[PDB]
């Protein structure tokens, strides 16, 4: 028993961050058998953050003017290219730790593990999830971009993000692997917003069965609702729109506990209406929304990784 | 910016990890060097949990009853001893994945990463606490005893924590990897019961500053309060009393926000006093106790780990 925010093993990752300094500007990159991969602005200097050409900047560039550190061991850059918003490095050693790995750009809601690292050494591991406005709330200091975002399925790690940049309400915005940002982001120092977020409806969802999982059932009730019925409400408090597709995914929950979808949106819905009256649930005051359908299910049955 | 429950990076302790099998029991193992440290109830039969004795049992077993298995490579046993409620199995094979690294027995109120394990295989990393009665609130399943909590510092590991059982209100207990139980807790099957726990008031206060740091600042006041005085509230709302050993080791704290700590406990009172009237701190709803002022100096200041 117990529900805690739990991320993936990092070592597979841990592997893999190098050390990226061109000029004056140091950060991290993924190192993958014989590419590192980096966010692309590591090629700007201070004075070409407002609006950058990044073409015109790395056609000024050559491979000897990019330093991969991994460890204490200065790798050779025999190569380089722009995708998107990242630069890939082709360098002559192939990482003899590369993990199997595939790159994955991920939906919304979704969540994964994220190794803040700092001149490409790992500091921590937390969890995280992709914000329906497509930001992450992370923690990342000066330093951190190029600490990437993963899941782990068997032995397989799928990276799914790469952290660029801090917004001013504090929050992060990156790229995939592949270098599109996620949402209407670009990588340069001009004024940019969130834009409004919203509450995860089918993770919070989720959430609430892990606590009848693990043996909480007061916030149950006896009614239940229409989809529709609970879409109005949840609209109301700016949870996101319950889909059939959302209700599919809970089935597997809703077996386990013998609740309804629908009766347990009609939980929610008196969460909602009501708040929780001094009351928590797995330890929290809030409805929280970072834990996935399929997160509930390895955590509450303990699915491992080789 | 931001602010995680963020866990120091595993792969240090996921390349120890092993599955140790005796009999019908299978748990995790620690694989250091040439030793392998595991619970001692591995040796125990299911009509053997009530009250065993565990010198009678291990008499009882050779080398060659103990399976351990690191990845698909079986480990032979060459030598067994016990320590207090750890067995000790010396193996013919020293781990070359073994990290530097430490035993150390921690206070209550000290926080730590824990690496659940399920038959020697990573599932997932999170932080803990020792809570002042002892236990501490993890995420365990069958099959998880062994699992290791540990610290980082630059490249050493510090092992704190080896998980033994669940207690019936779903918290956990262990020992120290000299497997000297935490609390008043012993490895038999009958009525234990936790002890009531209390909030850690020192690491409240650091999250505070943690708040104020990353720019929250609506919770404090004009007002101040003696540390008697404090305590004289504090008792009240179950928080274990703030010694001026805690006002010291809050001081760097203090001195990078400008608010005495005498401040920030006034702060802390009138939260205890009012609630936070529909407001949250970082993201939470309640007030957060498993982050040491350490913990928060190194995520707002961003301390790394070679």
Chains 1, 2 share one sequence.
């Not at 939906?107 to 490409?120: D, E, I, K, M, R």
Request: proline share 4%; glycine share 8%; charged share 15%.
């Amino acid at each position: 028993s117990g529900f805690r925010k739990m991320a993936f093993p990092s070592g597979k990752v841990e592997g893999c961050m190098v050390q990226v300094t061109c000029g004056t500007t140091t950060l991290n990159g993924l190192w993958l058998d014989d590419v590192v991969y980096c966010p692309r602005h590591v090629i700007c200097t201070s004075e070409d953050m407002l609006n950058p050409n990044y073409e015109d900047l790395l056609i000024r560039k050559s491979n000897h003017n990019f330093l991969v550190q991994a460890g204490n061991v200065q790798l050779r850059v025999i190569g380089h290219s722009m995708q998107n918003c990242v630069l890939k490095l082709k360098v002559d050693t192939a990482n003899p730790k590369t993990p199997k790995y595939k790159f994955v750009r991920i939906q919304p809601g979704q969540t994964f593990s994220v190794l803040a690292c700092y001149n490409g050494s790992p500091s921590g591991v937390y969890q995280c999830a992709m914000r329906p406005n497509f930001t992450i709330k992370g923690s990342f200091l000066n330093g951190s971009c190029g600490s990437v975002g993963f899941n782990i399925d068997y032995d397989c790690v799928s990276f799914c993000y790469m952290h660029h940049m801090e917004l001013p309400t504090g929050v992060h915005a990156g790229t995939d692997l592949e270098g599109n940002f996620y949402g209407p982001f670009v990588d340069r120092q001009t004024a940019q917003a969130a834009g409004t977020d919203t509450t995860i409806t089918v993770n919070v969802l989720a959430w609430l069965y892990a606590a009848v999982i693990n043996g909480d059932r007061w916030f149950l009730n006896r009614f239940t609702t229409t989809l529709n019925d609970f879409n109005l409400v949840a609209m109301k408090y700016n949870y996101e729109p319950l889909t059939q597709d959302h209700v599919d995914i809970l089935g597997p929950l809703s077996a386990q506990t013998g609740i309804a979808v629908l009766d347990m949106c009609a939980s929610l819905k008196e969460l909602l209406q009501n708040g929780m009256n001094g009351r928590t649930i797995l330890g929290s005051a809030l409805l929280e929304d970072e834990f996935t359908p399929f997160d509930v299910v390895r955590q509450c049955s303990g699915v491992t990784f080789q």
